[PDB]
């Protein structure tokens, strides 16, 4: 079967540029992880746009963490200077992002598509 795209985010959510009061950025392998250390006590939902092949996440386009008001508080994006990444790189990065949000007492949920294709 041909690859198919999962698009949790709307065009607006995907293109929006967001602000971090206490910027945190980490390059992990072929991925970049960003999070605002100032964000606490919120219900956060991770949404992502990515391709899938054989019922498994293949390539991540963009993953962002949203509060209930729709504000972006963290994200995982591929680094240009890299030829690619694997679901394994994605999982490593998601763990770091979720860990920081949990540490700051945010309740973190993951989109059903991410739960299904990344697990």
């Amino acid at each position: 079967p041909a690859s198919r795209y999962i698009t949790d985010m709307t065009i607006e959510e995907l293109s929006r540029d967001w602000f971090m009061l206490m910027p945190k950025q980490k390059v992990e392998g072929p991925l970049c992880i960003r999070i605002d250390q100032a964000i606490m006590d919120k219900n956060i939902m991770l949404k992502a746009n990515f391709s899938v092949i054989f019922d498994r996440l293949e390539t991540l386009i963009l993953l962002r963490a949203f509060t209930e008001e729709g504000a972006i508080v963290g994200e995982i994006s591929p680094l240009p200077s890299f030829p690619g990444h694997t679901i394994e790189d994605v999982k490593n990065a998601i763990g770091v992002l979720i860990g920081g949000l949990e540490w700051n007492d945010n309740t973190v949920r993951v989109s059903k598509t991410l739960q299904r294709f990344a697990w």
């Binding site: 967001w18 602000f19 009061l21 206490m22 910027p23 100032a38 504000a71 972006i72």
Partner: protein
């Protein structure tokens, strides 16, 4: 020696920075990130100090 704008917004909208503003172009404040037009830090102003090593707001000492 000629200005193109009739005037300009002098301070960035802090609410917009945190997605708490719906006024768009019509807001009294600027909706773009201009580190040179950030408002004064309330904490540095009233308390004389601020805990954010990366605070983007103005830290003005008692003049």
């Amino acid at each position: 020696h000629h200005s193109h704008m009739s005037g300009e917004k002098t301070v960035v909208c802090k609410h917009w920075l945190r997605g708490l503003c719906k006024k768009g172009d019509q807001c009294e404040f600027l909706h773009e990130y201009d580190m040179t037009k950030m408002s004064e830090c309330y904490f540095y102003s009233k308390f004389g100090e601020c805990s954010n090593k990366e605070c983007p707001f103005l830290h003005i000492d008692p003049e």
